[PDB]
Amino acid sequence: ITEAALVRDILYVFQGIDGKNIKMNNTENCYKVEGKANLSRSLRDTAVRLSELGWLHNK
Amino acid sequence: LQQSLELKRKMLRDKQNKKNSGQHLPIFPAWVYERPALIGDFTALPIGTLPLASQESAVVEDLLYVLVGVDGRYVSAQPLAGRQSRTFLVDPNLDLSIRELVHRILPVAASYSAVTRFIEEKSSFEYGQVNHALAAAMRTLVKEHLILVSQLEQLHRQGLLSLQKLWFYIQPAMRTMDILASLATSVDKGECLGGSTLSLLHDRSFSYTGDSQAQELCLYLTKAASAPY
């Protein structure tokens, strides 16, 4: 996967809508991204850091 | 649909035998109810194979049509209309995100189709002067909803509108439509007429006292619907 897709997708995760690559929706624990980009920081760390805005929106 | 025809006549008889000094109490022609177009509600590329941001423009076009009650190419209004709850069928093969956003945008369409049906069926003479003005002042807000979707069509023509911006623009009128549709559901369900549909408009106006986004709506509706009584 590519980060250009992560931007358009996490833009929906701010509204709370489930994403293409970011499947999980705080059902257990919190939002989580599953991907094979294997970008340690971009695929996971930055994405999860930004997803908690969507989690707060969900609450 | 068929079951309303009884109710109208059963009400008419009570007024006829009650009042004989005023004769030949009015009725509308049969086609006023039979014709389905008079009321508000009634080459396709496979959406699977396109890129994403073009699917967005397509669904936005179909939803801008749905807001006025007319069907869309990729989204259909289900014709069941059982009980009163309108339902819609989005195309099965879409991007999950866009599908869910379409579902979250869709309740204003279900809360427009019932709102127009209420205005047609409860604007016949039989339901009474108060139930007439309730629909007749709900009808002005239907017009203003049409104004809004016309402006959205202009913006969409200029390629300058997206589904995410649509989401924001339809929030103020989503509350309007939800208040009108739940209120219509209650008025029809209780078979309330006369002052029974002037009590319910008082109690729903107490219901929201600090909101002031729906309170002005309800206060205006009752100002207009209490002119008859």
From Swiss-Prot, chain A:
Tissue: Ubiquitously expressed.
Cysteine-cysteine disulfides: none
Subcellular location: Cytoplasm, Cytoskeleton, Microtubule organizing center, Centrosome
Ranges in coiled-coil conformation: none
Oligomeric form and interacting partners: Component of the gamma-tubulin ring complex (gTuRC) consisting of TUBGCP2, TUBGCP3, TUBGCP4, TUBGCP5 and TUBGCP6 and gamma-tubulin TUBG1 or TUBG2. TUBGCP2, TUBGCP3, TUBGCP4, TUBGCP5 and TUBGCP6 assemble in a 5:5:2:1:1 stoichiometry; each is associated with a gamma-tubulin, thereby arranging 14 gamma-tubulins in a helical manner. Gamma-tubulin at the first position is blocked by TUBGCP3 at the last position, allowing 13 protafilaments to grow into a microtubule.
Family designation: Belongs to the TUBGCP family.
Job of this protein: Component of the gamma-tubulin ring complex (gTuRC) which mediates microtubule nucleation. The gTuRC regulates the minus-end nucleation of alpha-beta tubulin heterodimers that grow into microtubule protafilaments, a critical step in centrosome duplication and spindle formation.
Name of this chain's protein: Gamma-tubulin complex component 3
From Swiss-Prot, chain B:
Keyword Acetylation: no
Predominant subcellular localization, coarse grouping: cytoplasm
Family assignment from sequence similarity: Belongs to the TUBGCP family.
CC per GO annotation: centrosome; ciliary basal body; cytoplasmic microtubule; cytosol; gamma-tubulin complex; membrane; microtubule organizing center; nucleoplasm
UniProt subcellular location: Cytoplasm, Cytoskeleton, Microtubule organizing center, Centrosome
Function as written in the Swiss-Prot or TrEMBL entry: Component of the gamma-tubulin ring complex (gTuRC) which mediates microtubule nucleation. The gTuRC regulates the minus-end nucleation of alpha-beta tubulin heterodimers that grow into microtubule protafilaments, a critical step in centrosome duplication and spindle formation. Plays a role in neuronal migration.
Variant or mutagenesis effect after changing residue 175 to C: In CDCBM15; uncertain significance
Summary of the tissues where the protein is detected: Ubiquitously expressed.
Recorded superkingdom: Eukaryota
Any single GO BP term: meiotic cell cycle
Name of the protein in question: Gamma-tubulin complex component 2
Organism: Homo sapiens (Human)
Keyword match Flavoprotein: no
Illness: Cortical dysplasia, complex, with other brain malformations 15: An autosomal recessive disorder characterized by global developmental delay, variably impaired intellectual development, speech delay, facial dysmorphism, microcephaly, and varying degrees of cortical malformations including pachygyria, thin corpus callosum and subcortical band heterotopia. Most patients have generalized seizures.
GO molecular function annotations of the record: gamma-tubulin binding
Keywords: Cytoplasm, Cytoskeleton, Disease variant, Epilepsy, Intellectual disability, Lissencephaly, Microtubule, Phosphoprotein
Subunit-level organization: Component of the gamma-tubulin ring complex (gTuRC) consisting of TUBGCP2, TUBGCP3, TUBGCP4, TUBGCP5 and TUBGCP6 and gamma-tubulin TUBG1 or TUBG2. TUBGCP2, TUBGCP3, TUBGCP4, TUBGCP5 and TUBGCP6 assemble in a 5:5:2:1:1 stoichiometry; each is associated with a gamma-tubulin, thereby arranging 14 gamma-tubulins in a helical manner. Gamma-tubulin at the first position is blocked by TUBGCP3 at the last position, allowing 13 protafilaments to grow into a microtubule.
Full-protein positions shown: 150 to 387 of 902
